[PDB]
Symmetry: D2
Subunit: 298 residues, 4 copies
Amino acid sequence: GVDLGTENLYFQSMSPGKLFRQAVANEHPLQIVGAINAYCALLAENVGFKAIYLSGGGVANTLGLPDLGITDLHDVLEDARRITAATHLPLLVDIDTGFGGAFTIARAIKEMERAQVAAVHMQDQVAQKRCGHRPGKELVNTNEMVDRIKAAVDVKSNDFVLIARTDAYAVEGLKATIDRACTYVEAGADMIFAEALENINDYPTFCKAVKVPVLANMTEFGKTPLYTAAQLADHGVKMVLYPRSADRAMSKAALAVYEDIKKHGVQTASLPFMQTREALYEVLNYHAYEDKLNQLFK
Amino acid sequence: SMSPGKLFRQAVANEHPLQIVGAINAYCALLAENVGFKAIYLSGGGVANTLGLPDLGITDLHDVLEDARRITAATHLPLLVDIDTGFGGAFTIARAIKEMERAQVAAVHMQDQVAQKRCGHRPGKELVNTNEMVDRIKAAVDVKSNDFVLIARTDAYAVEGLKATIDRACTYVEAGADMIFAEALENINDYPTFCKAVKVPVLANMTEFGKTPLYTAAQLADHGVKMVLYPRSADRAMSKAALAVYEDIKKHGVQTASLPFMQTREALYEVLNYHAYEDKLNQLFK
Amino acid sequence: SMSPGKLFRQAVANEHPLQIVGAINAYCALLAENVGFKAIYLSGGGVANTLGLPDLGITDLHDVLEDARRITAATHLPLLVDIDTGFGGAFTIARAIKEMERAQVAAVHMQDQVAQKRCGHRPGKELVNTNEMVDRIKAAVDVKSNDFVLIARTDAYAVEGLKATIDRACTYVEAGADMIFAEALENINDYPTFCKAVKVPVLANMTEFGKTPLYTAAQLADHGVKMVLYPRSADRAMSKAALAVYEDIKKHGVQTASLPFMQTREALYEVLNYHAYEDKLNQLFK
Amino acid sequence: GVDLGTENLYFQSMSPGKLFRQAVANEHPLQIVGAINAYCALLAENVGFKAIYLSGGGVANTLGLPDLGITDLHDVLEDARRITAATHLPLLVDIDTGFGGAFTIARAIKEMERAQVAAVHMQDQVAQKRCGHRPGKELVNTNEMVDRIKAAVDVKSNDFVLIARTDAYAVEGLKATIDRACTYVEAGADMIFAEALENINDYPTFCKAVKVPVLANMTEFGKTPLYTAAQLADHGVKMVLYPRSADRAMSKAALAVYEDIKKHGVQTASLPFMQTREALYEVLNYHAYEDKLNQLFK
Ligand SMILES: [Cl-]
Ligand SMILES: [Cl-]
Ligand SMILES: [Cl-]
Ligand SMILES: [Cl-]
C-alpha cells in the first residue's frame, strides 16, 4: 500500500518494537539519546537520531528527586506517554527493577506497550529492601532476575523489546557478567544492556558469548571511559546509549540564565545562548498547523 | 503559618521589584531557588511546547495542573501559574482555581483573549469584551481564598492603545483581580501612567524574540512596576544546549566535546540536596 | 489481528442489534463482559457525575481519557466513548481522537451541541450549524485510522424535527462520520425513515427518566436500528444500592440487613478471574 | 470570624486531619463508610456520615485487579483526589505498606496531605517479596513496622492522622497483637486499626492497653463477626469502619441490570431498582449551579 516513486511495493505496517529492531539492524551502531520531555525528543529527531531514551534517573531528577527508586510505574509511564504522543521514533524506557513482583512487572510491560513504547530495560539490582535501608548497589541472584524476565516475557507482544540490564561487571567482573547475560537471554531477554564495561577489547568476547544485540552505556562523570560509536561497533556493539548527556547541558544552561538575570537584572547577556523563536516554531512544525487549517477549513 | 498566596503577596511587597523566573519542571524550579529567586513561574506556552505542541490552546487544565503539582511538590517557593483564559466557562474556571489552590499554587494569571472560537478558526490574538473578562474574574473570585492571588492579564495595549488598556485593567481590578499583568508595553514611559492609574501591583513581561524591548528590573521598578516576569528565558537556553549535545554526539560519535558544557555530578547532587537524604536515614534508623 | 475499531465494526454488523451497555469503571466493564455483552460504553455524563459534578461540560479530555484507559486496561471488549463536542477547536479534537486510539478505544461519539459559549451562560441544549459540526467531523476524520469509528451524534430531532435531523445526519455522513447516534426519537416509526435515509448504522439511545420512551432491542432492530445504547442503566441501580447500604448502616448501627443484597466474595473472585493469577504463578515459578 | 446566630464567637480554621480528630471525639463511635468514588462520597455525606474511607482493595478491584499489591501510590492518590475535590468530609485512605521504603512512605504522606486527605492507615504486612511469590498474609517484625511509622511521622503535619493497622490478631493472638500496637503507638501512630478482633470482650483490654483511639473493621464474608456501633463503643472502640459494604451492593445491582437488559432486551424491569433523576440532581446539588449563575451573571 506504500509507494516508491510510482511503483507500488510491499511495505509491512511497523509496530514501535519492530521499528526499534529495524533501527538496530540498519545502523552500525544505533545511537540512542536521552530526552527528558517531548520537546527534547523532537530536537533529537530533527538532528536525525533513529531512537530515543527515557532515563529512570532522569525522570526522578527532573521531579527534583534523587535516583533512589522513590518513583513508580506512573512516574515513568506519564513521561513516556508525553514523548510517544509527539514522535513515532522508537522509544526505549528504563523501568528499573520492574516496580514490584510478577504482576507489577506484567502491568508495566502492558502499560508501556499501550503507551506505544518500543522497548524497556529492566535491571538485576535488589529492589525495595527494608524501610530504613541506605542507598547503594546490590545485585539480585540470577534466578531472581530470571523470574523478573519471565514475568515480562509472559505478557509481551512479539515485536516489543525486553532488554535485560546487568550491573554485574563492576561488582563481579567480566566472567560472572557474561554468565548472567547468557542466563538472561535464555530466559527470554531480546537484547542486553552491559553497564560499565571498561576495556573495549572485552566487547568482542562479551558480544560473541551473548549473541543477542548488546548496548553499551556512555555515561559521564562515572567510572567508565568514552569511546566513539564506530569504535564500539567495530568491537561488536549494536546500540550505544547517551542517557543524560543533553540534560546535564540543559541544567548548566538554565543555571547560567538564572544567574545572569539575578546578577544583571535582565537577560541580555543570555540572548546569544538561547534558541531563536524561529528554530522553536520549526521544531514544533508550527507551519503544518496553519497549513492543516487551510487544507481543511475556511 | 504562611499560605502560598500570602508568601507571594509578601514577596511582591518586600521586593523592588519581584523577579519571577520561568521554570519548566521541578529541577529548574530548584536551580532557580538555589540562585535565590523569591518566586517562580509556570508558563502556559512552556507547558504546550514542552509537550511538543504549539501554544494554540490545545492544552487543558490537567496539562498545566500536572506540571504545577510536580513543581510545588519539590519547592515551597511561591508559584505563579498561567491558566490561559480559564479553559472554559464559569465552572471550569472555578474548578481551575480550586485545583490550583489544592496544588499549593500561590497565584494564577488569566487573560482577556477570545477562547475556543469556531472549530476551524485561524490562530491569532483577539480580545474579549471587558464584560466577558469581568465574568471570568467573578467566576474566579467567587471560589478563591483570600490569600490566593488572581492576576488579570490584558493584551489590550498592542490592539487598543494605552488609554483603553488602562480602562480594562481598572474594570478588572474592580471585578476583583488582585494584580495586573500588562502585556506588551513598548515605551517604558507608558508604565508610570499605567501603574499609577491601576493602583494594584503590576507585572511587566520581559520576553525575548517578541515585539517588546528589554528593560532592567531597576528601570521597570522606577517606573512603578512591582513584578518582572522572565517566562521562557531559561528554557530557550536549555533547548540550544540540548540541541548542541545532540549535534555533537551525531557528528563526532561521542559526547566528549560537550563535557565542559555539562553540570557536574556534584552540582547535581547538591541541587537535589542529596546529602539530606543520607543524613535523614542516619538520623532515624540503624 | 483485529484492531479495537474493527472489533466494534464487526460487532455492529454481526449483531441485530448491537446492545452497548454503560460501565462507569473497569469492574463494571468486567461484569458486563461476563454477562456476555459484545460492546461497552463510557458515558460523558457518567464521568462528570462519578466525579461528583453535573453534566455541564466541566470535564475535559483528561477526565474521560483516564476513565477510558482504566477500562481498556481490564478488557478488550470494544469500547465506545463519549467525547462530548470534542473539548475545543480542530487541534483539541485531533488530540482527542489520537489519545482515544492510543488508549485502545474502539469508537467515540461527538455531538452537534454548542460548545463553551460565554463565561456566564445558563445551562441548556443548543445546536451548532451543520457547517460547524462538519468542521468538527473533518478535524476528527483527518487524524483517525481507517478502522476507528467516528459516530456523529445529533440532538436535532427535539429542536428541529425529523426532516432537518435527517438532513444534518446525511451531511455528517458525507463529512466522514462512520455511523450515527440519533438522540431523542420519540415515535419508533420515525426510525425506518431515518435509518433508510442515513444508510450508515444508526444507534438509538435508550435512556431512563428523560423525554424518550423505551423500546426493546428487537423492536428497534425491526425499525432499522443497528445499535442500542444503555448509557446509565447500571449506574442508577448502583447508586440506589449504595444509598440503601449507607442508610442501613446509619439506621441500624450495622450492615446485617444489607448482606443479602451484596455480591458474594466468590462471585467477586470469579469476575476478577482470581484463579488465573494463582495458576499463572504456578505455571511460571516455584 | 464565624457566627452563632448574631453572636460572633471564636472558631478555629480546621484542617482535614483536625476535622477527623474532632469527628472521633464527638461521635460515639465514629462510623466511617467505604466510598469508591466522589459520587458515593456524596451519598454517604447526604445520609449524614461524618467520615469516609478509600479502601485499598476497593481501588484495585475497581480497576479490575485483585488485591495483590499490584497498585501503587498513584492509583490510590488519584482516587483520593477525586473524592476530596467533591467533599470536605474527612477522608481516611488505605496506603497499604507504604508502597516502598522510607522515602516512598514520605512521598505518600506528603502527597496525601497535599490531596486534602485527613488520615491514612498503613499495615504491618510483608511488602514486595520475591518476583514469583504466591499471594498470602505475612507480618513484618515489629521493628520493620516501627521504621515505617517513623518515616511517616517524620514528615507528617501535627493534625494529620497516622493509623497503624495490625493483622497480628488472626496469626499471633491477642497478647502479641497488643504488644505491637503499643510499640506502634510509641513510634508515633496516632490511632490503631485492629483487624479481625473476634470476641468483643477482648476490646476493653485492647483499648485500655493501647490508650489511643481504636478502629474496629466491620468486613463481610470474612472470619470476623458483625457487632453494632453501639456495642463496639460500649466496649471502648472509637471508630467503626465499613470498608466494602456499599460496593458489594453496587456490584450485585449492576450485574442485575446487565442480566435484565440481556435477558429482556430492555431495562423496564430494572426501573424500580434505579435512583431517580431527581435524587441524582439533588445529590449533585445541581440547583446551586443554576443559583450561582443567577447570583453572579446575566
Ligand atoms: Cl509557539
Ligand atoms: Cl564553568
Ligand atoms: Cl446532571
Ligand atoms: Cl440472589
